[PDB]
């Protein structure tokens, strides 16, 4: 076996589908050569590490093995490491083309201690002629102010439905798997902008049931079906909604967090009802979510959420 | 003298009940030799740990102690242990092994974001030389990157058949007699948790059996585990509904004091009883559910219990006027 | 005051101004940063011995022409003093003691002066405050950079960049 | 396809050369020209300058087509040079536009060849030119006695005062637990010339140096048995150790009054 | 009397035997039988397997009616052996219900009886399982040169790659400060057989080892003056130091 999130990883900067302007800027940087220190921030699973990896590859060509120092969460990143190894790598002699430079790729920089990030300022400022730093973090708020001041911030937005759909189309074209539009829509729904999670769910569905159909996708994701959730959030009488929640969703052992998240994601795409009622139902669902997350996942909370949703949909 | 929670533990795969859907799949997986990282998540008292230890035993034979690394919750694992111990165990090659090593983390949902990132990176780096298994009670508390690396398996609580079969088995290996309504009370109070059943059974065995042959009634099983009683619940409900304020308040205080019950159990039982009533107005149900959920959320933060009890009484009374 | 203490928001010109002031008067700069192990013993051995010495670089570079009589001296620039982490035990106390009993100019640079960690530097050092530069100077500098880089920018975009950067010149 | 090929007749020569000043210098540039090897480097505190000249008469084979600069750390160099045994020949090789340097250890009567690679370190060389000055005092004394005097005086205080007056050397140290003084008089010995103290002076001088710098300098007393000292009232002291084909010079600046 | 009586020729022999695996093993159980003493143990990381055997030829008086197990700590045993002069003779004496082993240093001209008791820490984890007897390549070379090359290449990295091609033994190391390659060739020296290099090759081999375990192995260089190495792919390598009446062998596991 081989994970499809690892076999179909983009190795060139052009294969990455997503934010077009940032990718164009990175392509121009790789074509020119003058690359500055950069912090890449964004949500998980939208191609942050892969982006800087393809950037370093296209920049260094055959020198990736000698002019790239990658540090992830597995390696030790303390005071001694930053003071010794990074410093000795920055001063390391290397003959490169006039535009290229050495690259230090620090993945998950938001996990590095403040003291360790402190000892990198002068290291990255004094050796700016032969060393360029590339940090990759999920939260740009945990990086100290001098570091954020020294490098340019590149924000990555969540993936739209069209780009994920095109990537899945390319994957199924190259993999020769049978599918339907309903299964693709279900995968886009359950992926909520996570390309890696989308590819993983597609591979799981293919390996489990072969045919990519909405039923198989919602069976392998082990989440409440959006159809029955929409039926619960649109009943005319509150009694039928409570019965649907009791017999069909609560008896099957579904987690309250999963039920609330599915109701949230269904109310967002419920194009039938108006905008104000959608926003208010989303507010109520989020209040119920906050109540559940605070240590009380009682069925009474979901019952009250349904009661409020019904009262708001009737008023 | 070993506990029934530990004595009746399934030592192999065929002795876990109510989880056939996952048992057949894991059997096929260990028979095809394509065992990936497994994320066993679900409510407690279901059989995750027993299933995984039985699988590890069936795979490794006598090499269990040398080829299986059992790791637990926080245990002072800030960033150090996941960085050194797990990494070495995944990197250290055994001396006479033909295969891969297994590291099983129990209730690993309590790890911090940095620890979860370190763990997922370790899994990514050594996915070819070892396999990982993570146990969890809530799959939402884990980083969405760790989920996309392994295969998930939800452990839906045991149905009635598995629990009654296990009650039969524990009655075979122990001289106890159980009343027909005793097993009904047990399955109603268990909520599909075998651990609590095996905990409550030994307690009643220890306390009640003077000649080791008595009959366990609903009274003792309700008293030991500290659970409400349906008759008492209905009496409190009727007293709140029909009688006036002084009498209903006094009855509620007497019930919640002379038996040692908490307001959370009273509220959930009251709403469970009210679920099936044929009330005329729907605004009644709306107000009832809203106010009861508000009272429960406020109780969750530890207020003055008398005030929330009076508020429960007032809400129940004021909702039934339409 | 024996020692001067520079502080202010990040990227406003502390290190640049310090280095330029030290290099204009003909002095010799001995700079130490957070990327060096400034413990108690290393400060007692490394820098303490160089407190009252003369530069061999400043001597062998140029000492024959009557340019200045302080070219054989030291300006000790301790940069990023607020960044001494847990791997530097006793560094603050030893640096406060070095703020006295010295014979050469000692300039300390930090970001937050009112931090409780920087307490021992209460009265022993002259602390002047660097503030966020005004928008006009940043606009003039950006216009100079643009006219040197051969590109024209709308003065509204420059003001909006100054607003989003909150005064950081290195950031703009 | 190599620029320079250098062949040391003994492997221990370069080992001792590097060990002589590996305690005061961390990064160092080696300028390889047709005349030999020249390498100068300032201390981390910019108080002790180390210069080293190894002429072509010390290499068994030495091409050095055109001058090159090899910047390398002394710690890794001492770690690499430590491997070789006594009965081996050492060969230094640098490729065109060198990113590393090759050190070969070969045996005279065995096919055991040990090749090591060392990654060069980029160093912004602030090359300062040193001119010959008329030092007020110039002398030479056995390196063992000088190292003994330094190790003896440095235990009392952190500053050693050297005074040359009336054909008399005086090393004094004023500490907290007390004081210490050592007086040296020049004399010649016909049976053992290596135990004779030379003296040439123009004006009496008085200088003050640190204890750590002297303790670091005296460690190079394993290259030659006689060390030369040049002192001036306004110039940094010069401590010279002569090698059979060059020298090693330590420029140490005095303290203030 | 005693069931177990074992006398050595000198005292510096057991000293170096215990010094052999003093850095990779904490506790060990010696099996005393009629044919001599045997022992084996594994490290806490389960990578290095030490096996010691000494027959009845290195001893002078050996009497053990039935095999006995002595599980004892090595650190305290070395602390005890440190007090022994090079002119004494050790006499291990053991009785029924083994709970305390008695060492006795005795001289033959001056009356110096040094008796020391040592408690027995029983672990009951023997697990003696040896299966492989056929290796891909074999070689023998002076232990001094091996230890020299090991502790010379250990500074550059943590993984040393030993590869045996056609009559060219090669040790490689690659790290951050540089690289290192030691290439040796077999040769027979008639003037000194102890400085010869013997090699038997069936197939070319190439495999890596850890620097820490190799440094722990080379610490047993005081036993003999010539070490034997047996390499075989997908098989633990064997490092053997012979002895006048036995051997000390380390089984090492390769890396990835
Ligand atoms: N824009 C994209 N186009 C194509 N494939 C993508 C894209 N973004 C992600 N992927 C796929 O998702 C896989 C994993 O994405 P990663 O870049 O490793 O995640 P990430 O951006 O680093 O976020 P983290 O590491 O979880 S914080 C890649 O190997 C790709 O196969
Ligand atoms: N399916 C089952 N069949 C029989 N006994 C079970 C079953 N599940 C649990 N038990 C009993 O309950 C004990 C504890 O089970 P565990 O596997 O530890 O529960 P769990 O699913 O791991 O959830 P935890 O441990 O509370 S996080 C076992 O030793 C058994 O005695
Ligand atoms: N007043 C200024 N005018 C022009 N450029 C400036 C000015 N201040 C800072 N810069 C730019 O910012 C760069 C670095 O400024 P520094 O003074 O070194 O930052 P800093 O004050 O030390 O703050 P830290 O140390 O990062 S917290 C300089 O090389 C200039 O390019
Ligand atoms: Mg990443
Ligand atoms: Mg368990
Ligand atoms: Mg600065």
Coordinates of N, CA and C in Angstrom, one line a residue, chain E residues 32-152:
Chain E
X32 N 27.2 -21.3 36.3 CA 28.4 -22.1 36.6 C 28.0 -23.6 36.4
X33 N 28.8 -24.2 35.5 CA 28.5 -25.6 35.2 C 29.8 -26.4 35.3
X34 N 29.8 -27.7 34.9 CA 31.0 -28.5 35.0 C 32.0 -28.2 34.0
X35 N 31.6 -27.7 32.8 CA 32.5 -27.3 31.7 C 33.1 -25.9 31.9
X36 N 32.7 -25.2 32.9 CA 33.2 -23.8 33.1 C 32.1 -22.9 33.4
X37 N 32.3 -21.6 33.2 CA 31.4 -20.5 33.5 C 30.9 -19.9 32.1
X38 N 29.6 -19.7 32.0 CA 29.0 -19.0 30.9 C 28.2 -17.9 31.3
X39 N 27.9 -16.9 30.4 CA 27.1 -15.8 30.8 C 26.6 -15.1 29.5
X40 N 25.5 -14.5 29.5 CA 25.0 -13.7 28.4 C 24.0 -12.6 28.9
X41 N 24.0 -11.5 28.2 CA 23.1 -10.4 28.6 C 22.8 -9.5 27.4
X42 N 21.8 -8.6 27.6 CA 21.5 -7.7 26.6 C 21.4 -6.3 27.2
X43 N 21.6 -5.3 26.4 CA 21.5 -3.9 26.9 C 20.0 -3.5 27.1
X44 N 19.9 -2.3 27.7 CA 18.5 -1.8 27.9 C 17.8 -1.4 26.6
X45 N 18.6 -1.1 25.6 CA 18.0 -0.8 24.3 C 17.9 -2.0 23.4
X46 N 18.3 -3.2 23.9 CA 18.1 -4.5 23.2 C 18.8 -4.4 21.8
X47 N 20.0 -4.0 21.7 CA 20.8 -3.9 20.5 C 22.0 -4.8 20.5
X48 N 22.7 -4.7 21.7 CA 24.0 -5.4 21.8 C 23.8 -6.6 22.8
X49 N 24.2 -7.8 22.3 CA 24.1 -9.1 23.1 C 25.5 -9.5 23.4
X50 N 25.8 -9.5 24.7 CA 27.1 -9.9 25.1 C 27.1 -11.4 25.6
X51 N 28.1 -12.2 25.2 CA 28.2 -13.6 25.5 C 29.6 -13.9 26.0
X52 N 29.7 -14.3 27.2 CA 31.0 -14.7 27.8 C 31.1 -16.2 28.0
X53 N 32.2 -16.8 27.7 CA 32.4 -18.2 28.0 C 33.8 -18.4 28.4
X54 N 34.1 -19.1 29.5 CA 35.4 -19.5 30.0 C 35.4 -20.9 30.5
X55 N 36.2 -21.8 29.9 CA 36.2 -23.2 30.2 C 36.9 -23.5 31.5
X56 N 37.5 -24.7 31.6 CA 38.2 -25.1 32.8 C 39.7 -25.1 32.6
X57 N 40.1 -24.5 31.5 CA 41.6 -24.4 31.2 C 42.2 -23.2 31.8
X58 N 41.5 -22.1 31.9 CA 42.1 -20.9 32.5 C 42.1 -20.9 34.0
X59 N 41.3 -21.8 34.6 CA 41.3 -22.0 36.1 C 42.4 -23.0 36.5
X60 N 42.7 -23.1 37.8 CA 43.6 -24.1 38.3 C 42.9 -25.1 39.2
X61 N 41.9 -24.7 40.0 CA 41.0 -25.7 40.7 C 39.6 -25.3 40.4
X62 N 38.8 -26.2 39.8 CA 37.4 -26.0 39.5 C 36.6 -27.1 39.9
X63 N 35.7 -26.9 40.8 CA 34.8 -28.0 41.3 C 33.4 -27.4 41.5
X64 N 32.5 -27.9 40.7 CA 31.1 -27.5 40.7 C 30.2 -28.8 40.4
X65 N 29.6 -29.3 41.5 CA 28.9 -30.6 41.3 C 27.6 -30.4 40.5
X66 N 26.8 -29.4 40.8 CA 25.6 -29.1 40.0 C 25.6 -27.6 39.6
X67 N 25.1 -27.4 38.4 CA 25.1 -26.0 37.9 C 24.3 -25.0 38.8
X68 N 24.9 -23.8 38.9 CA 24.3 -22.8 39.8 C 24.2 -21.5 39.1
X69 N 23.3 -20.7 39.5 CA 23.0 -19.4 38.9 C 23.4 -18.3 39.9
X70 N 24.3 -17.4 39.5 CA 24.7 -16.3 40.3 C 24.4 -15.0 39.6
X71 N 23.2 -14.3 40.0 CA 22.9 -13.1 39.4 C 23.3 -11.9 40.2
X72 N 24.3 -11.1 39.7 CA 24.9 -10.1 40.5 C 25.1 -8.8 39.7
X73 N 25.3 -7.7 40.4 CA 25.5 -6.4 39.7 C 27.0 -6.4 39.3
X74 N 27.2 -5.7 38.2 CA 28.5 -5.6 37.6 C 29.3 -4.4 38.2
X75 N 28.6 -3.3 38.5 CA 29.3 -2.1 39.1 C 29.9 -2.4 40.4
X76 N 29.1 -3.0 41.3 CA 29.6 -3.3 42.6 C 30.7 -4.4 42.5
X77 N 30.5 -5.3 41.6 CA 31.5 -6.4 41.4 C 32.8 -5.7 41.0
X78 N 32.8 -4.7 40.1 CA 34.0 -4.0 39.7 C 34.6 -3.2 40.8
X79 N 33.7 -2.6 41.7 CA 34.2 -1.9 42.8 C 34.9 -2.8 43.8
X80 N 34.5 -4.1 43.9 CA 35.1 -5.1 44.7 C 36.4 -5.5 44.1
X81 N 36.4 -5.8 42.8 CA 37.6 -6.2 42.1 C 38.7 -5.2 42.1
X82 N 38.3 -3.9 42.2 CA 39.3 -2.8 42.2 C 40.3 -2.9 43.3
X83 N 39.9 -3.6 44.4 CA 40.8 -3.7 45.6 C 41.8 -4.8 45.5
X84 N 41.9 -5.5 44.4 CA 42.7 -6.7 44.2 C 44.1 -6.3 43.6
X85 N 45.1 -6.7 44.2 CA 46.5 -6.5 43.7 C 46.8 -7.5 42.6
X86 N 47.8 -7.2 41.8 CA 48.2 -8.1 40.7 C 48.9 -9.3 41.1
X87 N 49.1 -9.5 42.4 CA 49.8 -10.7 42.9 C 48.9 -11.7 43.7
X88 N 47.7 -11.4 43.8 CA 46.7 -12.2 44.5 C 46.1 -13.2 43.6
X89 N 45.3 -14.1 44.2 CA 44.6 -15.2 43.4 C 43.2 -15.2 43.9
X90 N 42.2 -15.1 43.0 CA 40.8 -15.1 43.4 C 40.3 -16.5 43.5
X91 N 39.4 -16.7 44.5 CA 38.8 -18.0 44.8 C 37.4 -17.8 45.0
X92 N 36.6 -18.0 44.0 CA 35.1 -17.9 44.1 C 34.6 -19.2 44.8
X93 N 34.0 -18.9 46.0 CA 33.4 -20.0 46.8 C 31.9 -19.8 47.0
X94 N 31.1 -20.8 46.7 CA 29.7 -20.8 46.8 C 29.1 -22.0 47.4
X95 N 28.0 -21.8 48.2 CA 27.4 -22.8 49.0 C 26.0 -23.0 48.7
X96 N 25.2 -23.7 49.5 CA 23.8 -23.9 49.3 C 23.0 -22.6 49.4
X97 N 21.9 -22.5 48.8 CA 21.0 -21.4 48.8 C 21.8 -20.1 48.5
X98 N 22.2 -19.9 47.2 CA 23.1 -18.8 46.9 C 22.4 -17.4 47.1
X99 N 22.9 -16.7 48.1 CA 22.4 -15.4 48.4 C 23.5 -14.4 48.6
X100 N 24.8 -14.9 48.8 CA 25.9 -14.0 48.9 C 27.2 -14.7 48.5
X101 N 27.8 -14.2 47.4 CA 29.0 -14.8 46.9 C 30.2 -14.2 47.6
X102 N 31.2 -15.0 47.9 CA 32.4 -14.6 48.7 C 33.6 -14.6 47.8
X103 N 34.2 -13.5 47.6 CA 35.5 -13.4 46.9 C 36.6 -13.4 48.0
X104 N 37.7 -14.0 47.6 CA 38.8 -14.1 48.6 C 40.2 -13.9 47.8
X105 N 40.8 -12.8 48.1 CA 42.2 -12.5 47.6 C 43.2 -13.1 48.6
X106 N 44.1 -13.9 48.1 CA 45.1 -14.6 48.9 C 46.4 -14.5 48.2
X107 N 47.5 -14.3 49.0 CA 48.9 -14.2 48.5 C 49.5 -15.6 48.9
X108 N 50.7 -15.8 48.3 CA 51.4 -17.1 48.5 C 52.7 -16.9 49.3
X109 N 53.1 -15.7 49.7 CA 54.3 -15.5 50.6 C 54.0 -14.8 51.8
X110 N 53.1 -13.8 51.8 CA 52.7 -13.0 53.0 C 51.2 -13.3 53.2
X111 N 50.8 -13.4 54.5 CA 49.4 -13.7 54.8 C 48.5 -12.5 54.6
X112 N 47.9 -12.4 53.5 CA 46.9 -11.4 53.2 C 45.6 -12.0 52.7
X113 N 44.7 -12.2 53.6 CA 43.4 -12.8 53.3 C 42.4 -11.7 53.2
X114 N 42.0 -11.3 52.0 CA 41.0 -10.3 51.8 C 39.7 -10.9 51.4
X115 N 38.7 -11.0 52.3 CA 37.4 -11.6 52.1 C 36.4 -10.5 51.8
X116 N 35.5 -10.7 50.9 CA 34.5 -9.8 50.5 C 33.2 -10.5 50.2
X117 N 32.1 -10.1 50.8 CA 30.8 -10.7 50.5 C 30.0 -9.7 49.5
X118 N 29.2 -10.4 48.7 CA 28.4 -9.6 47.7 C 27.1 -10.3 47.4
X119 N 26.0 -9.5 47.7 CA 24.7 -10.1 47.6 C 24.4 -10.4 46.1
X120 N 23.4 -11.3 45.9 CA 23.0 -11.7 44.6 C 21.7 -11.1 44.2
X121 N 21.6 -10.3 43.1 CA 20.4 -9.7 42.6 C 19.8 -10.6 41.5
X122 N 18.8 -11.4 41.9 CA 18.2 -12.3 41.0 C 17.2 -11.6 40.1
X123 N 17.4 -11.8 38.7 CA 16.4 -11.2 37.8 C 15.6 -12.3 37.1
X124 N 16.1 -13.5 36.9 CA 15.4 -14.6 36.3 C 15.0 -14.3 34.9
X125 N 15.9 -13.7 34.1 CA 15.6 -13.4 32.7 C 16.9 -13.8 32.0
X126 N 16.9 -15.1 31.6 CA 18.0 -15.6 30.9 C 17.9 -15.5 29.4
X127 N 16.9 -16.1 28.8 CA 16.6 -16.0 27.4 C 17.8 -16.3 26.5
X128 N 18.4 -17.5 26.6 CA 19.6 -17.8 25.8 C 19.1 -18.5 24.5
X129 N 19.3 -17.8 23.4 CA 18.8 -18.2 22.1 C 19.8 -17.8 21.0
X130 N 20.6 -18.7 20.5 CA 21.6 -18.5 19.5 C 21.3 -19.4 18.3
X131 N 21.1 -18.9 17.1 CA 20.6 -19.6 16.0 C 21.6 -19.6 14.8
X132 N 22.2 -18.4 14.5 CA 22.9 -18.2 13.3 C 24.4 -18.7 13.5
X133 N 24.9 -19.5 12.6 CA 26.2 -20.0 12.6 C 27.0 -19.8 11.3
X134 N 26.3 -19.3 10.2 CA 26.9 -19.1 8.9 C 26.9 -17.6 8.5
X135 N 28.0 -17.0 8.4 CA 28.1 -15.6 8.1 C 28.6 -15.4 6.6
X136 N 28.4 -14.2 6.1 CA 28.8 -13.8 4.8 C 30.2 -13.5 4.6
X137 N 30.9 -12.9 5.6 CA 32.3 -12.5 5.4 C 32.9 -12.6 6.8
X138 N 34.2 -13.0 6.9 CA 34.9 -13.1 8.1 C 36.2 -12.4 8.0
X139 N 36.7 -11.8 9.1 CA 38.0 -11.1 9.0 C 38.6 -11.1 10.5
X140 N 39.9 -11.0 10.5 CA 40.6 -10.9 11.8 C 41.7 -9.9 11.7
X141 N 41.8 -9.0 12.6 CA 42.8 -7.9 12.6 C 43.1 -7.4 14.0
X142 N 44.2 -6.8 14.2 CA 44.6 -6.4 15.6 C 43.6 -5.5 16.2
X143 N 43.2 -5.8 17.5 CA 42.2 -5.0 18.2 C 42.6 -3.5 18.4
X144 N 43.9 -3.3 18.5 CA 44.4 -1.9 18.7 C 44.0 -1.0 17.5
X145 N 44.3 -1.5 16.3 CA 44.0 -0.7 15.1 C 42.5 -0.6 14.9
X146 N 41.7 -1.6 15.2 CA 40.3 -1.5 15.2 C 39.7 -0.4 16.1
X147 N 40.2 -0.5 17.4 CA 39.8 0.5 18.3 C 40.2 1.9 17.9
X148 N 41.4 2.1 17.3 CA 41.9 3.3 16.9 C 40.9 3.9 15.8
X149 N 40.7 3.1 14.7 CA 39.8 3.5 13.7 C 38.4 3.9 14.2
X150 N 37.9 3.1 15.1 CA 36.6 3.3 15.7 C 36.5 4.6 16.4
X151 N 37.4 4.8 17.3 CA 37.3 6.1 18.1 C 37.9 7.3 17.3
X152 N 38.4 7.0 16.1 CA 38.8 8.2 15.2 C 37.6 8.6 14.4

